[PDB]
Homo-oligomer: A and B are copies of this chain.
Amino acid sequence: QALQKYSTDLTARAREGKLDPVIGRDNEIRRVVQVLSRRTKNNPVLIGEPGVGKTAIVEGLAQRIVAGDVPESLRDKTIVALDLGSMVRGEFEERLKAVLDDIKNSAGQIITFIDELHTIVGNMIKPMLARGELRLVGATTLDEYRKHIEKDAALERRFQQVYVGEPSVEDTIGILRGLKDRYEVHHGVRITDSALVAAATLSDRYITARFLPDKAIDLVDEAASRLRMEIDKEEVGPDDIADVVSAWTGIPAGRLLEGETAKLLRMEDELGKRVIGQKAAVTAVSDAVRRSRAGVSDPNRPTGAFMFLGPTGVGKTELAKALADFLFDDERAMVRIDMSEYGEKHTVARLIGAPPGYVGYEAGGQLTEAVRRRPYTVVLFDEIEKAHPDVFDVLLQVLDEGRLTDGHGRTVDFRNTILILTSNLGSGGSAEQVLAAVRATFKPEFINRLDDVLIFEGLNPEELVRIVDIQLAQLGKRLAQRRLQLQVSLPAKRWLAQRGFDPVYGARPLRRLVQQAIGDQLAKMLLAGQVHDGDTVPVNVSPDADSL
Chain A residues in the interface with B (C-beta under 8 A)? 5, 8, 30, 33-35, 37-41, 50-51, 69, 71, 81, 83-86, 97, 115-116, 119, 122-124, 126-127, 130, 141, 144, 152-155, 157, 182-183, 186-187, 217-218, 221-222, 225-226, 228-229, 231-232, 261, 265, 287, 290-291, 294-299, 336, 338, 340-341, 344, 346-347, 349-350, 353-363, 365-366, 369-370, 405, 407-409, 436, 439-440, 444, 478-479, 481-482, 511, 515, 519-520, 522-524, 526-527
User: In the bound complex, do residue A349 and residue B359 qualify as a contact, i.e. CB atoms below 8 Å apart?
Assistant: no
Q: Once bound together, how far apart are the Cα atoms of A297 and B523, in whole Å? A: 9
User: In the bound complex, do residue A225 and residue B354 qualify as a contact, i.e. CB atoms below 8 Å apart?
Assistant: no
Complex copy number for this chain = 3
Q: Which residue of B lies closest to A519 (CB)?
A: B296
Q: A35-B222, A295-B482, A354-B356 are in contact. List 11 more A-B contacts (CB 8 A).
A: A8-B130, A69-B232, A291-B527, A298-B519, A299-B478, A349-B356, A349-B357, A356-B359, A357-B361, A359-B362, A360-B362
User: Given A69-B232, A85-B154, A296-B523, do A347 and B354 touch, yes or no (CB 8 Å)?
Assistant: yes
Nearest 6 interchain pairs by C-beta: A366-B409, A356-B360, A354-B357, A85-B123, A85-B154, A85-B124
Q: Once bound together, how far apart are the Cα atoms of A298 and B229, in whole Å? A: 40
User: Given A153-B115, A154-B144, A409-B350, do A436 and B221 touch, yes or no (CB 8 Å)?
Assistant: no
- Distance to closest chain B CB from A88 (angstroms): 9
Query: What are 23 pairs between A and B in contact, CB < 8 Å?
Result: A34-B225, A35-B222, A35-B225, A37-B187, A38-B225, A40-B221, A69-B232, A71-B229, A83-B127, A119-B123, A141-B154, A291-B519, A296-B479, A296-B519, A298-B515, A344-B354, A349-B355, A350-B407, A356-B358, A359-B361, A360-B362, A360-B408, A369-B409
Question: Inside 8 A of A232's CB, which chain B residues have their CB?
Answer: 30, 69, 71
Question: Inside 8 A of A478's CB, which chain B residues have their CB?
Answer: 296, 298-299
Q: Which residue of B lies closest to A40 (CB)?
A: B221
User: Given A123-B86, A153-B116, A520-B291, do A355 and B346 touch, yes or no (CB 8 Å)?
Assistant: yes
User: Given A228-B71, A354-B356, A357-B359, do A221 and B38 touch, yes or no (CB 8 Å)?
Assistant: yes
Contact of A115 among B34, B116, B154 (CB under 8 A): B154
Question: Inside 8 A of A350's CB, which chain B residues have their CB?
Answer: 354-356, 407, 409
- Distance to closest chain B CB from A115 (angstroms): 7
Q: Once bound together, how far apart are the Cα atoms of A126 and B87, in whole Å? A: 11
Q: Once bound together, how far apart are the Cα atoms of A363 and B356, in whole Å? A: 9
Q: Once bound together, how far apart are the Cα atoms of A216 and B360, in whole Å? A: 42
- Distance to closest chain B CB from A189 (angstroms): 12
User: In the bound complex, do residue B346 and residue A358 qualify as a contact, i.e. CB atoms below 8 Å apart?
Assistant: yes
Contact of A229 among B30, B296, B520, B523 (CB under 8 A): B30
User: Given A115-B153, A157-B51, do A405 and B296 touch, yes or no (CB 8 Å)?
Assistant: no
User: Given A296-B522, A349-B356, A359-B361, do A221 and B85 touch, yes or no (CB 8 Å)?
Assistant: no
Question: Inside 8 A of A482's CB, which chain B residues have their CB?
Answer: 295
